Backbone as ProteinMPNN parsed JSONL, in Angstrom:
{"seq_chain_A": "XXXXXXXXXXXXXXXXXXXXXXXXXXXXXXXXXXXXXXXXXXXXXXXXXXXXXXXXXXXXXXXXXXXXXXXXXXXXXXXXXXXXXXXXXXXXXXXXXXXXXXXXXXXXXXXXXXXXXXXXXXXXXXXXXXXXXXXXXXXXXXXXXXXXXXXXXXXXXXXXXXXXXXXXXXXXXXXXXXXXXXXXXXXXXXXXXXXXXXXXXXXXXXXXXXXXXXXXXXXXXXXXXXX", "coords_chain_A": {"N_chain_A": [[141.151, -96.7, 66.092], [144.324, -98.536, 64.307], [144.368, -101.622, 65.46], [147.456, -102.394, 68.171], [149.358, -104.94, 67.499], [147.865, -105.295, 65.165], [148.708, -103.986, 63.48], [151.824, -104.602, 63.738], [151.072, -107.404, 61.226], [150.071, -105.763, 59.357], [151.822, -105.916, 56.332], [154.015, -108.574, 54.486], [154.981, -110.411, 56.56], [157.841, -112.441, 57.164], [158.694, -116.053, 59.051], [159.443, -118.665, 61.021], [159.034, -122.059, 61.892], [160.011, -124.26, 64.373], [159.723, -127.071, 65.705], [160.188, -130.297, 67.974], [159.925, -132.628, 68.255], [158.6, -136.12, 69.546], [157.675, -139.294, 69.191], [156.354, -142.317, 70.825], [158.403, -142.952, 71.394], [160.452, -142.615, 68.855], [161.942, -139.787, 67.509], [162.377, -136.772, 66.172], [162.989, -134.237, 63.798], [161.185, -130.937, 62.638], [162.08, -128.686, 60.195], [161.242, -125.191, 59.32], [159.603, -123.677, 56.819], [158.555, -119.185, 55.949], [156.103, -117.453, 54.516], [153.658, -115.341, 55.621], [150.645, -113.445, 55.186], [148.227, -111.558, 55.812], [146.542, -110.009, 55.648], [144.993, -110.602, 53.202], [144.391, -113.798, 54.304], [146.673, -115.253, 53.934], [149.77, -117.839, 54.019], [152.616, -119.558, 53.424], [154.339, -121.527, 53.123], [156.888, -124.4, 53.906], [157.993, -127.159, 54.986], [160.344, -129.252, 55.918], [161.567, -132.297, 57.388], [164.46, -132.748, 60.055], [165.946, -134.78, 60.685], [166.32, -136.322, 59.3], [164.028, -139.451, 58.112], [160.417, -138.464, 58.656], [158.638, -139.564, 61.007], [156.41, -140.408, 61.103], [152.68, -139.988, 59.536], [153.592, -136.948, 56.972], [150.346, -134.879, 56.656], [149.761, -135.468, 59.579], [150.675, -133.373, 61.181], [149.983, -131.051, 60.247], [148.331, -129.06, 61.031], [149.785, -128.542, 63.563], [151.952, -127.662, 63.181], [149.656, -120.498, 62.998], [148.032, -119.2, 63.826], [147.949, -116.229, 64.579], [147.875, -115.339, 61.039], [145.169, -115.402, 59.832], [142.739, -113.965, 57.81], [140.772, -111.577, 59.354], [138.147, -110.532, 58.629], [136.633, -106.66, 58.65], [133.746, -105.894, 60.274], [135.054, -107.603, 62.137], [137.082, -107.725, 63.411], [137.461, -107.212, 66.03], [136.998, -108.948, 67.412], [139.939, -110.325, 67.072], [142.157, -112.612, 68.963], [144.927, -113.377, 68.152], [146.431, -111.795, 67.241], [146.149, -109.817, 68.84], [147.937, -110.534, 71.634], [150.189, -110.255, 70.306], [153.543, -107.996, 70.356], [154.477, -110.014, 72.139], [152.785, -112.066, 71.804], [152.138, -115.968, 72.505], [150.835, -119.16, 74.068], [150.377, -121.56, 72.813], [148.212, -124.999, 73.656], [147.896, -128.087, 72.542], [144.952, -130.943, 72.184], [145.714, -134.084, 70.797], [143.686, -136.747, 70.045], [143.5, -138.88, 67.817], [140.858, -141.516, 66.166], [140.163, -144.986, 67.869], [143.814, -144.637, 67.633], [146.936, -143.413, 68.671], [147.694, -139.966, 70.989], [148.724, -137.156, 70.361], [150.209, -134.905, 71.929], [150.805, -130.99, 72.164], [152.742, -128.433, 72.619], [153.346, -124.736, 72.24], [154.851, -121.664, 71.658], [153.832, -119.357, 70.574], [155.317, -115.897, 68.707], [157.474, -112.255, 67.559], [160.633, -112.709, 67.154], [161.755, -110.597, 66.498], [161.802, -109.446, 63.478], [160.449, -111.21, 62.563], [158.309, -114.322, 63.03], [157.522, -116.231, 64.388], [156.999, -119.467, 65.108], [157.535, -121.998, 67.472], [157.496, -125.612, 69.213], [156.8, -128.12, 71.476], [156.817, -131.647, 70.367], [155.094, -134.332, 72.015], [154.117, -137.695, 71.336], [152.129, -140.407, 72.366], [150.727, -143.956, 72.608], [150.432, -145.385, 69.75], [149.547, -147.602, 67.09], [151.987, -149.59, 66.083], [150.714, -151.082, 63.467], [149.095, -148.958, 62.352], [147.04, -146.032, 61.373], [148.947, -144.288, 61.204], [151.456, -144.355, 62.308], [152.049, -146.932, 60.851], [152.064, -145.583, 58.305], [149.018, -144.592, 56.152], [148.206, -142.63, 55.254], [146.495, -140.139, 53.004], [148.317, -137.574, 51.834], [146.935, -135.895, 51.139], [144.723, -133.019, 51.824], [141.623, -131.353, 54.268], [139.608, -129.086, 53.961], [138.327, -126.65, 56.015], [136.083, -125.555, 59.414], [136.685, -123.758, 62.014], [135.356, -123.805, 65.196], [135.63, -120.407, 67.475], [136.186, -119.753, 70.595], [136.081, -117.793, 73.231], [138.173, -117.859, 76.884], [137.919, -116.947, 78.977], [138.637, -117.192, 82.224], [141.385, -117.82, 82.463], [142.207, -115.798, 80.295], [142.764, -115.992, 77.879], [141.593, -117.663, 74.85], [139.836, -121.319, 73.394], [139.576, -123.811, 71.071], [137.968, -126.255, 70.229], [137.256, -128.566, 67.456], [137.487, -131.041, 65.039], [139.385, -133.099, 62.458], [139.526, -134.736, 59.836], [141.547, -137.043, 57.789], [141.804, -138.112, 54.692], [141.836, -141.873, 54.007], [144.007, -144.606, 52.309], [143.197, -147.299, 52.115], [140.412, -146.232, 52.113], [137.77, -144.055, 53.289], [137.84, -143.059, 56.298], [139.902, -140.996, 58.523], [139.875, -140.212, 61.968], [141.032, -137.127, 64.146], [140.955, -135.603, 66.784], [140.639, -132.282, 68.014], [141.768, -130.846, 70.296], [142.217, -127.464, 72.206], [143.627, -124.6, 73.539], [144.411, -121.674, 74.329], [147.219, -119.316, 75.643], [147.909, -115.886, 76.284], [151.335, -115.092, 76.674], [152.177, -111.917, 77.107], [152.205, -109.893, 80.06], [149.881, -108.188, 78.552], [147.476, -105.954, 77.385], [145.197, -108.022, 76.167], [142.289, -109.321, 73.144], [139.712, -110.614, 73.084], [137.706, -112.48, 72.117], [134.432, -113.064, 71.16], [132.272, -115.793, 69.767], [134.101, -117.108, 67.231], [134.231, -118.557, 63.758], [136.822, -119.993, 62.284], [137.857, -120.347, 58.734], [138.905, -122.735, 57.344], [141.467, -123.468, 54.32], [143.592, -125.454, 53.112], [146.505, -125.977, 50.771], [149.063, -129.125, 50.275], [151.626, -129.701, 49.04], [154.874, -130.901, 47.032], [158.162, -129.686, 47.041], [159.849, -130.205, 43.581], [162.752, -130.169, 43.673], [163.577, -131.016, 45.658], [165.543, -133.311, 47.882], [165.351, -134.397, 50.133], [162.57, -135.215, 52.98], [159.671, -133.693, 52.764], [157.221, -131.035, 53.326], [155.323, -128.943, 52.091], [153.035, -126.552, 52.331], [150.225, -124.868, 51.355], [148.094, -122.101, 52.141], [144.609, -120.794, 52.931], [143.599, -118.66, 55.034], [140.186, -117.789, 56.639], [138.241, -115.655, 58.899], [134.881, -115.765, 59.772], [131.102, -115.841, 61.006], [130.106, -113.707, 62.601]], "CA_chain_A": [[142.351, -96.512, 65.066], [144.684, -100.032, 63.964], [145.5, -102.086, 66.884], [149.335, -102.602, 68.11], [149.168, -106.345, 67.882], [146.925, -105.758, 63.982], [149.901, -103.22, 62.839], [152.716, -106.436, 62.557], [150.49, -107.643, 60.379], [149.843, -105.266, 58.058], [152.927, -106.426, 54.932], [154.005, -109.568, 54.068], [155.896, -111.165, 56.608], [158.186, -114.1, 57.225], [158.05, -116.902, 59.355], [160.092, -119.795, 60.811], [158.155, -122.228, 62.784], [160.896, -125.276, 64.759], [159.829, -128.82, 65.745], [161.043, -130.755, 68.092], [158.777, -134.424, 67.857], [158.439, -137.52, 69.737], [155.94, -140.257, 68.872], [156.267, -143.491, 70.57], [160.178, -142.775, 71.244], [160.831, -142.036, 67.63], [162.318, -138.635, 68.105], [162.425, -136.816, 64.617], [162.448, -132.851, 63.892], [160.971, -130.249, 62.126], [162.695, -127.609, 59.805], [159.546, -124.177, 58.218], [160.572, -121.273, 56.764], [157.687, -118.866, 54.874], [155.33, -115.895, 54.404], [152.348, -114.345, 56.478], [149.692, -111.639, 54.483], [147.014, -111.644, 57.255], [145.598, -108.928, 54.908], [143.94, -112.18, 51.916], [144.497, -115.199, 55.928], [147.187, -116.34, 53.019], [150.213, -118.322, 54.343], [152.966, -120.105, 52.37], [155.568, -122.231, 54.412], [158.057, -124.87, 53.272], [158.694, -127.673, 56.169], [161.911, -130.004, 56.137], [162.595, -133.195, 58.424], [166.353, -132.312, 59.346], [166.334, -136.024, 61.273], [165.539, -138.192, 57.875], [162.36, -139.415, 57.638], [159.35, -138.407, 59.117], [158.104, -141.247, 61.441], [154.175, -140.199, 61.041], [153.139, -138.941, 57.65], [152.724, -134.625, 57.254], [149.25, -133.62, 57.157], [148.961, -135.555, 60.703], [151.527, -132.142, 61.594], [149.177, -129.736, 59.964], [146.856, -128.27, 62.365], [150.602, -127.791, 64.421], [153.256, -126.732, 62.66], [150.115, -119.679, 64.169], [146.476, -118.701, 63.575], [147.401, -115.169, 63.081], [147.489, -114.559, 59.579], [144.217, -115.495, 60.401], [141.985, -112.979, 57.402], [139.329, -111.141, 60.2], [136.871, -109.147, 58.583], [136.58, -105.281, 58.69], [133.9, -105.631, 60.935], [134.933, -108.809, 62.779], [138.842, -107.746, 63.184], [137.445, -106.792, 67.678], [138.146, -110.765, 68.236], [141.169, -111.095, 66.732], [142.891, -112.554, 69.888], [145.935, -113.922, 68.258], [147.005, -110.835, 66.974], [146.378, -108.608, 69.886], [148.607, -111.45, 71.76], [151.557, -109.535, 70.131], [154.451, -108.849, 70.447], [154.933, -111.127, 73.04], [152.917, -114.109, 71.927], [150.636, -116.967, 73.105], [151.37, -120.314, 73.998], [149.168, -123.112, 72.192], [148.846, -126.622, 74.273], [146.381, -129.115, 72.525], [145.415, -133.298, 72.433], [144.944, -134.156, 68.738], [143.892, -138.018, 69.736], [143.424, -139.866, 66.323], [140.313, -142.248, 66.839], [141.451, -145.751, 67.084], [145.006, -144.948, 67.925], [147.152, -142.618, 69.887], [148.073, -139.089, 70.592], [149.531, -135.815, 70.479], [150.069, -133.436, 73.041], [151.668, -130.535, 71.981], [152.434, -126.995, 73.135], [153.951, -124.079, 71.254], [154.744, -120.87, 71.157], [154.312, -118.126, 68.905], [155.85, -114.603, 69.404], [158.27, -112.022, 67.665], [161.406, -112.301, 67.676], [162.723, -109.4, 65.881], [160.674, -109.289, 61.774], [160.018, -112.591, 61.568], [157.266, -114.66, 63.463], [158.299, -117.784, 65.365], [156.659, -120.902, 65.947], [158.286, -123.395, 68.15], [156.538, -126.535, 69.552], [157.346, -129.256, 71.218], [155.14, -132.247, 70.03], [154.963, -135.441, 72.266], [152.684, -138.414, 70.655], [152.557, -142.089, 72.848], [149.413, -145.334, 72.315], [150.279, -145.306, 68.686], [149.581, -148.817, 67.4], [152.854, -149.994, 64.391], [150.387, -151.129, 62.265], [147.833, -147.912, 62.856], [147.315, -145.662, 59.542], [149.536, -143.722, 61.615], [153.245, -145.132, 62.603], [152.174, -147.523, 59.025], [151.765, -144.213, 56.897], [148.011, -144.609, 56.29], [146.778, -141.042, 54.985], [146.514, -140.451, 51.781], [148.846, -137.231, 51.181], [146.017, -134.728, 51.256], [143.417, -132.256, 52.695], [140.525, -130.954, 54.11], [138.463, -126.607, 54.568], [136.886, -127.393, 57.952], [136.066, -124.421, 60.563], [137.616, -124.328, 63.635], [135.197, -123.067, 65.772], [136.82, -120.186, 68.54], [135.646, -119.687, 72.186], [136.697, -117.004, 75.04], [138.505, -118.825, 77.52], [137.9, -115.179, 79.885], [139.16, -117.172, 83.298], [142.788, -117.442, 81.431], [142.413, -114.528, 79.414], [142.667, -117.311, 76.792], [140.645, -118.307, 73.535], [139.887, -122.414, 72.975], [138.952, -124.394, 70.398], [138.16, -128.622, 69.361], [137.405, -129.834, 66.267], [137.963, -132.823, 64.211], [140.005, -133.194, 61.49], [139.2, -135.508, 58.837], [142.529, -137.601, 57.042], [141.604, -139.759, 53.943], [142.825, -142.948, 54.866], [144.72, -144.447, 51.209], [142.527, -147.624, 51.12], [138.721, -145.4, 51.785], [137.932, -143.872, 54.688], [138.722, -141.397, 57.063], [141.339, -141.141, 60.252], [139.819, -139.437, 62.329], [142.03, -136.064, 64.631], [139.868, -135.353, 67.59], [142.167, -131.96, 68.035], [141.424, -130.282, 71.804], [142.879, -126.354, 71.409], [144.519, -123.706, 74.087], [145.636, -120.565, 73.977], [147.071, -118.503, 76.314], [148.557, -114.842, 76.033], [153.182, -114.603, 76.692], [152.353, -111.496, 78.148], [150.47, -108.896, 80.882], [149.343, -106.626, 77.971], [146.026, -106.647, 77.519], [144.289, -108.873, 74.798], [141.066, -109.499, 72.846], [138.717, -111.851, 74.482], [136.748, -112.974, 70.84], [132.176, -113.308, 71.207], [132.192, -117.109, 69.688], [133.628, -116.96, 65.933], [135.058, -119.75, 63.632], [137.846, -119.837, 61.24], [137.406, -121.045, 57.768], [140.578, -123.068, 56.337], [141.945, -125.052, 52.981], [145.475, -126.128, 53.378], [146.793, -127.079, 49.918], [150.382, -130.055, 50.306], [152.865, -129.91, 47.359], [156.711, -130.825, 47.052], [159.667, -129.252, 46.053], [161.056, -131.457, 42.911], [163.99, -130.071, 43.316], [163.467, -131.273, 47.395], [165.458, -134.668, 48.266], [164.988, -134.308, 52.184], [161.392, -135.633, 53.285], [159.599, -132.409, 53.136], [156.152, -130.661, 53.222], [154.649, -127.853, 50.885], [152.337, -125.543, 53.284], [149.625, -123.702, 51.009], [147.097, -121.925, 53.531], [144.264, -119.91, 53.164], [142.553, -118.882, 56.668], [139.41, -116.348, 56.91], [137.748, -115.44, 59.971], [134.049, -115.924, 59.522], [130.417, -116.766, 62.207], [129.236, -112.943, 63.36]], "C_chain_A": [[142.933, -98.75, 64.745], [145.497, -99.868, 65.196], [147.234, -102.561, 66.702], [149.47, -103.867, 67.834], [148.95, -106.122, 65.988], [148.527, -104.842, 62.953], [151.156, -104.6, 62.384], [152.303, -106.657, 62.158], [150.575, -107.466, 58.986], [151.379, -105.581, 56.545], [152.99, -107.8, 55.018], [154.706, -109.944, 55.417], [156.539, -113.187, 57.348], [158.007, -115.295, 58.783], [159.051, -117.865, 59.497], [158.921, -120.71, 61.471], [159.731, -123.67, 62.761], [159.776, -126.886, 65.453], [159.994, -129.016, 66.62], [159.88, -131.924, 69.061], [159.106, -136.095, 69.089], [157.486, -138.421, 69.508], [156.702, -142.116, 69.118], [157.435, -144.185, 70.562], [160.788, -142.794, 70.507], [160.522, -140.814, 67.015], [162.644, -137.966, 66.075], [162.387, -134.083, 65.083], [162.382, -131.732, 62.869], [161.326, -128.516, 61.559], [162.414, -126.203, 59.245], [160.323, -123.354, 58.286], [159.452, -121.405, 54.942], [157.6, -117.94, 54.535], [154.291, -116.596, 54.871], [151.878, -113.845, 55.175], [148.76, -112.014, 54.764], [146.324, -110.217, 56.02], [145.428, -110.191, 54.008], [144.584, -112.931, 52.799], [146.044, -115.752, 54.74], [148.754, -117.183, 53.484], [150.768, -119.785, 53.44], [154.045, -120.652, 52.743], [155.505, -124.149, 53.576], [158.423, -126.103, 55.108], [160.205, -129.112, 55.888], [162.115, -130.791, 57.652], [163.928, -133.22, 58.429], [166.858, -133.711, 60.435], [166.187, -137.258, 60.033], [164.435, -137.99, 57.764], [161.351, -139.568, 58.492], [159.191, -139.63, 59.695], [156.017, -141.061, 61.16], [153.749, -139.967, 60.127], [152.793, -136.954, 57.737], [152.089, -134.233, 57.571], [148.315, -134.287, 58.644], [150.042, -133.984, 61.588], [150.777, -131.109, 61.143], [149.092, -128.765, 60.41], [148.675, -127.752, 63.695], [151.578, -127.157, 64.112], [152.543, -125.104, 62.369], [148.387, -119.0, 63.156], [146.679, -117.003, 63.291], [148.143, -114.004, 62.194], [146.466, -114.971, 59.328], [143.648, -113.382, 59.442], [140.746, -112.723, 58.52], [138.765, -110.032, 58.279], [137.372, -107.842, 59.023], [135.926, -105.227, 59.983], [133.979, -106.383, 62.127], [136.79, -108.544, 63.431], [139.324, -107.337, 65.597], [137.546, -108.752, 68.569], [138.989, -111.598, 68.31], [142.07, -111.452, 68.21], [144.078, -112.303, 69.279], [146.621, -113.259, 66.997], [146.847, -109.528, 67.385], [147.656, -109.099, 70.559], [149.997, -110.752, 71.512], [152.383, -108.378, 69.758], [154.055, -110.013, 70.355], [155.06, -112.398, 72.909], [151.913, -114.606, 72.92], [151.381, -117.884, 73.399], [150.302, -121.266, 73.997], [149.129, -124.226, 72.384], [147.186, -127.289, 73.166], [147.036, -130.83, 72.411], [144.518, -133.051, 71.663], [145.069, -136.23, 69.202], [142.809, -138.58, 68.356], [142.013, -141.873, 67.042], [140.251, -143.96, 66.69], [142.439, -146.19, 66.878], [145.677, -143.913, 68.588], [146.742, -141.415, 69.587], [149.034, -138.218, 71.069], [149.049, -135.052, 71.288], [151.516, -132.227, 73.018], [151.495, -128.858, 72.445], [153.971, -126.569, 73.091], [154.304, -122.928, 72.4], [155.762, -119.941, 70.266], [154.627, -116.339, 68.801], [156.493, -114.138, 68.172], [159.503, -113.011, 67.606], [162.118, -111.973, 66.451], [161.037, -109.275, 64.447], [160.465, -110.238, 61.752], [159.133, -113.426, 63.081], [158.305, -116.155, 63.926], [157.67, -118.692, 65.842], [157.018, -122.234, 66.876], [157.112, -123.804, 69.115], [157.448, -127.734, 69.631], [155.927, -130.053, 71.271], [155.964, -134.13, 70.893], [153.84, -136.756, 71.489], [153.696, -139.604, 71.519], [151.099, -142.928, 72.038], [149.655, -145.529, 70.742], [149.824, -146.982, 68.145], [150.624, -148.56, 64.873], [151.788, -150.26, 63.758], [149.009, -150.184, 61.596], [147.938, -147.338, 61.563], [148.361, -144.389, 60.011], [150.926, -143.432, 61.013], [152.608, -146.402, 61.024], [152.31, -146.659, 57.708], [150.512, -144.461, 55.546], [146.976, -144.141, 55.307], [147.934, -141.131, 53.425], [147.542, -138.263, 51.568], [148.113, -135.662, 51.004], [145.666, -133.34, 52.032], [142.65, -131.24, 52.786], [140.435, -129.175, 53.68], [138.161, -127.594, 55.015], [136.826, -125.473, 58.309], [136.403, -125.293, 61.854], [136.523, -123.795, 64.248], [136.273, -122.483, 68.232], [135.879, -120.186, 69.204], [136.243, -119.061, 73.445], [136.242, -118.269, 76.223], [138.266, -117.356, 79.075], [138.525, -115.36, 81.589], [140.887, -117.459, 83.054], [143.699, -116.7, 80.524], [142.731, -115.129, 77.942], [141.215, -116.741, 75.547], [140.32, -120.262, 73.557], [139.353, -122.388, 71.993], [138.531, -126.004, 70.774], [137.259, -128.249, 67.85], [138.273, -130.655, 65.484], [138.212, -132.067, 62.609], [140.626, -134.26, 60.904], [140.203, -136.081, 57.935], [142.179, -138.794, 56.165], [142.441, -141.03, 54.196], [143.45, -144.108, 53.021], [143.871, -145.716, 50.899], [140.74, -146.824, 50.885], [138.371, -145.667, 53.192], [138.528, -143.473, 54.963], [139.564, -141.902, 58.515], [140.846, -140.272, 61.252], [140.416, -138.142, 63.498], [141.179, -135.386, 65.627], [140.359, -133.628, 68.269], [140.625, -131.002, 69.412], [142.066, -128.608, 71.94], [143.034, -125.196, 72.9], [145.081, -122.984, 74.446], [145.644, -119.319, 74.789], [148.261, -117.583, 76.236], [150.767, -114.935, 76.485], [153.071, -113.632, 77.836], [152.013, -111.153, 79.369], [149.693, -108.0, 80.32], [147.409, -106.742, 78.175], [145.636, -107.223, 76.15], [142.481, -108.552, 74.36], [140.435, -110.056, 72.553], [137.857, -111.743, 72.881], [135.441, -113.163, 71.81], [133.028, -115.109, 70.034], [132.333, -116.471, 67.569], [134.255, -118.602, 65.526], [135.558, -119.136, 62.792], [137.898, -120.788, 59.762], [138.73, -121.543, 57.578], [140.966, -123.856, 55.202], [143.074, -124.705, 53.075], [145.678, -127.792, 51.552], [147.749, -128.258, 50.078], [151.029, -129.986, 48.865], [154.099, -130.897, 47.644], [157.445, -130.334, 45.728], [160.048, -130.031, 44.509], [162.284, -131.526, 42.785], [164.406, -130.108, 44.779], [163.827, -132.802, 47.246], [165.548, -134.616, 50.38], [163.248, -134.501, 51.996], [160.663, -134.212, 53.615], [158.229, -131.929, 53.152], [156.387, -128.901, 52.426], [153.591, -126.927, 51.488], [151.569, -125.279, 51.701], [148.721, -123.404, 51.209], [146.197, -120.865, 53.29], [142.765, -120.181, 53.978], [141.256, -117.526, 56.651], [138.306, -116.046, 58.214], [136.233, -114.855, 59.624], [132.603, -115.551, 61.306], [129.786, -114.887, 62.85], [129.119, -112.354, 61.422]], "O_chain_A": [[142.269, -99.775, 64.9], [146.331, -99.136, 65.727], [147.933, -102.887, 65.743], [150.595, -103.853, 68.333], [149.795, -106.725, 65.326], [149.098, -105.264, 61.947], [151.335, -105.242, 61.349], [152.858, -105.889, 61.372], [150.858, -108.151, 58.003], [151.245, -104.605, 55.806], [152.064, -108.355, 55.609], [155.724, -109.32, 55.12], [156.077, -114.273, 57.699], [157.008, -115.124, 59.483], [159.684, -118.156, 58.482], [157.833, -120.149, 61.609], [160.335, -124.015, 61.745], [159.059, -127.229, 64.513], [160.164, -127.904, 67.121], [159.321, -131.871, 70.157], [160.052, -136.875, 68.986], [156.322, -138.083, 69.726], [157.242, -142.862, 68.302], [157.709, -145.3, 70.118], [161.963, -142.972, 70.827], [159.542, -140.533, 66.325], [163.002, -138.625, 65.099], [162.045, -133.245, 65.917], [163.402, -131.507, 62.217], [161.026, -127.475, 62.144], [163.371, -125.809, 58.578], [161.117, -122.702, 58.964], [159.405, -120.442, 54.176], [158.566, -117.267, 54.175], [153.964, -117.777, 54.752], [152.606, -113.82, 54.182], [148.217, -112.878, 54.076], [145.18, -109.843, 56.278], [146.151, -111.032, 54.541], [145.736, -113.042, 52.38], [146.36, -116.919, 54.967], [149.189, -116.84, 52.385], [150.08, -120.689, 52.965], [154.975, -119.862, 52.58], [154.617, -124.796, 53.02], [159.01, -125.68, 56.104], [160.227, -128.956, 54.667], [162.574, -130.304, 58.686], [164.638, -133.518, 57.469], [167.984, -133.7, 60.933], [166.027, -138.477, 59.969], [163.803, -136.975, 57.472], [161.233, -140.623, 59.115], [159.501, -140.674, 59.122], [154.926, -141.63, 61.119], [154.645, -139.518, 59.413], [152.062, -136.168, 58.341], [152.173, -133.387, 58.46], [147.146, -134.069, 58.966], [149.822, -133.841, 62.791], [150.959, -130.069, 61.776], [149.694, -127.707, 60.229], [148.623, -126.804, 64.478], [152.042, -126.18, 64.699], [153.254, -124.181, 61.973], [148.101, -118.528, 62.056], [146.095, -116.387, 62.399], [148.609, -112.869, 62.289], [146.484, -115.101, 58.104], [143.875, -112.252, 59.873], [139.833, -113.546, 58.591], [139.111, -109.262, 57.383], [138.402, -107.782, 59.695], [136.58, -104.806, 60.937], [133.264, -106.11, 63.091], [137.464, -109.493, 63.831], [140.369, -107.251, 66.243], [137.915, -109.331, 69.59], [139.17, -112.681, 68.866], [142.723, -110.491, 68.618], [144.594, -111.219, 69.553], [147.172, -113.829, 66.055], [147.146, -108.478, 66.815], [148.636, -108.394, 70.319], [150.838, -110.687, 72.409], [151.964, -107.71, 68.814], [153.607, -110.77, 69.494], [155.47, -113.077, 73.85], [151.193, -114.054, 73.752], [152.581, -117.765, 73.149], [149.562, -121.649, 74.904], [149.794, -124.928, 71.622], [145.992, -126.989, 73.159], [148.074, -131.492, 72.447], [143.447, -132.455, 71.554], [146.026, -136.939, 68.891], [141.586, -138.557, 68.218], [142.23, -142.793, 67.83], [140.28, -144.394, 65.538], [142.69, -147.276, 66.355], [144.872, -143.298, 69.288], [145.958, -141.149, 68.675], [149.912, -138.405, 71.911], [147.915, -134.598, 71.442], [152.644, -132.341, 73.499], [150.443, -128.232, 72.575], [155.037, -127.093, 73.415], [154.152, -123.068, 73.614], [156.875, -119.751, 69.778], [153.59, -115.682, 68.89], [156.468, -115.009, 67.303], [159.314, -114.148, 68.038], [162.785, -112.654, 65.672], [159.825, -109.103, 64.579], [160.124, -110.555, 60.612], [159.452, -112.988, 64.186], [159.393, -116.693, 63.719], [157.698, -118.845, 67.063], [156.576, -123.367, 66.684], [156.228, -123.12, 69.63], [158.255, -128.249, 68.858], [154.8, -129.786, 71.687], [156.915, -134.802, 70.494], [152.708, -136.397, 71.164], [154.907, -139.818, 71.552], [150.571, -142.473, 71.023], [148.61, -146.049, 70.351], [149.783, -147.71, 69.137], [150.409, -148.115, 63.746], [151.676, -149.26, 63.048], [148.212, -150.519, 60.719], [148.658, -147.819, 60.689], [148.571, -143.517, 59.168], [151.395, -142.82, 60.053], [153.383, -146.238, 60.082], [152.564, -146.954, 56.541], [150.806, -144.516, 54.352], [145.918, -144.525, 54.809], [148.996, -141.59, 53.003], [146.796, -137.699, 50.767], [148.679, -134.589, 50.792], [146.462, -132.767, 52.775], [142.631, -130.323, 51.965], [141.252, -128.403, 53.178], [137.869, -128.763, 54.759], [137.318, -124.522, 57.703], [136.423, -126.413, 62.363], [136.504, -122.691, 63.703], [136.803, -123.04, 69.194], [134.765, -120.509, 68.792], [136.746, -119.637, 74.409], [135.283, -118.993, 76.489], [138.895, -117.458, 80.128], [138.845, -114.382, 82.264], [141.518, -117.007, 84.009], [144.87, -116.72, 80.147], [142.912, -114.379, 76.982], [140.352, -115.864, 75.517], [141.357, -120.514, 74.173], [138.679, -121.423, 71.634], [139.002, -126.656, 71.706], [136.641, -127.186, 67.798], [139.493, -130.801, 65.412], [137.695, -131.163, 61.952], [141.741, -134.72, 61.148], [139.892, -135.651, 56.824], [142.179, -139.981, 56.492], [143.617, -141.035, 54.558], [142.303, -144.174, 52.582], [143.547, -145.783, 49.713], [140.065, -146.851, 49.855], [138.473, -146.632, 53.95], [139.643, -143.25, 54.491], [139.663, -142.928, 59.188], [141.633, -139.339, 61.417], [139.589, -138.531, 64.322], [140.598, -134.411, 65.152], [140.47, -133.823, 69.48], [139.421, -130.75, 69.397], [143.06, -128.872, 71.264], [141.87, -125.12, 73.293], [146.198, -123.173, 74.927], [144.746, -118.479, 74.846], [149.403, -118.034, 76.146], [150.953, -113.854, 75.926], [153.449, -113.843, 78.988], [151.452, -112.051, 79.997], [148.979, -107.195, 80.917], [146.574, -107.362, 78.832], [145.911, -106.625, 75.11], [141.675, -107.852, 74.974], [140.427, -110.179, 71.328], [137.38, -110.629, 72.664], [135.507, -113.373, 73.021], [134.223, -115.233, 69.766], [131.515, -115.891, 66.856], [134.602, -119.5, 66.294], [135.178, -118.04, 62.381], [137.985, -122.009, 59.893], [139.676, -120.759, 57.653], [140.701, -125.057, 55.257], [143.454, -123.535, 53.114], [145.438, -128.968, 51.275], [146.859, -129.103, 49.987], [150.579, -130.342, 47.776], [154.055, -131.635, 48.629], [157.452, -130.407, 44.499], [161.079, -130.646, 44.785], [162.956, -132.36, 42.178], [165.353, -129.438, 45.192], [163.029, -133.595, 46.746], [165.928, -134.992, 51.489], [162.676, -134.013, 51.021], [161.003, -133.604, 54.63], [157.677, -132.968, 52.788], [157.319, -128.101, 52.34], [153.195, -126.322, 50.491], [152.331, -125.488, 50.757], [147.874, -124.12, 50.676], [146.757, -119.772, 53.374], [141.766, -120.898, 53.93], [141.626, -116.351, 56.652], [137.274, -116.666, 57.959], [136.151, -113.687, 59.243], [133.017, -115.154, 62.395], [128.877, -114.996, 63.674], [128.354, -111.445, 61.098]]}, "name": "protein", "num_of_chains": 1, "seq": "XXXXXXXXXXXXXXXXXXXXXXXXXXXXXXXXXXXXXXXXXXXXXXXXXXXXXXXXXXXXXXXXXXXXXXXXXXXXXXXXXXXXXXXXXXXXXXXXXXXXXXXXXXXXXXXXXXXXXXXXXXXXXXXXXXXXXXXXXXXXXXXXXXXXXXXXXXXXXXXXXXXXXXXXXXXXXXXXXXXXXXXXXXXXXXXXXXXXXXXXXXXXXXXXXXXXXXXXXXXXXXXXXXX"}
């Protein structure tokens, strides 16, 4: 049959993202709006810095700013933890270590508020170098394809993942961002604990030519594989 959580993602779902961030004492907020079509693993989102100029590079916030919109192929529907936790949602926590630089720690709640899928995030960044690639804005407005390997955490009744993001550096070379992730359901209801698999993601970053605020337009495709 069609899972309860799965039925909530059959059409185009509107998305709201809210982030409050603090990086080396530099406080900022981001609001995002768009839509998710999980049948096609498709996300279209636009993000606005509501406090003015973003004090970090936009590409460093992409993983933080809704894996419930991944396309799980038919043979893999049983492994979709993210949709199975809905509508009550899940807590998504990360540490992101920027090699030779500081770290982000993030706590988010991903859940339905009526028809809207909400990602509400707190971000804390510490130990960044003022002349580093992040606070120095040396990352290209760019993003690579990747595979995120997802594994069950039965003890916490959720999942974990660790992956590397590579951010192109303007001179040359790559800035590594080491992600450690844990997701736990918010509700007491049953959820799907998946077999080992991975999410294949491609991301295109762009600008709205009519937008004067510091912003990022994100087009993303996410597909489950590996079984």
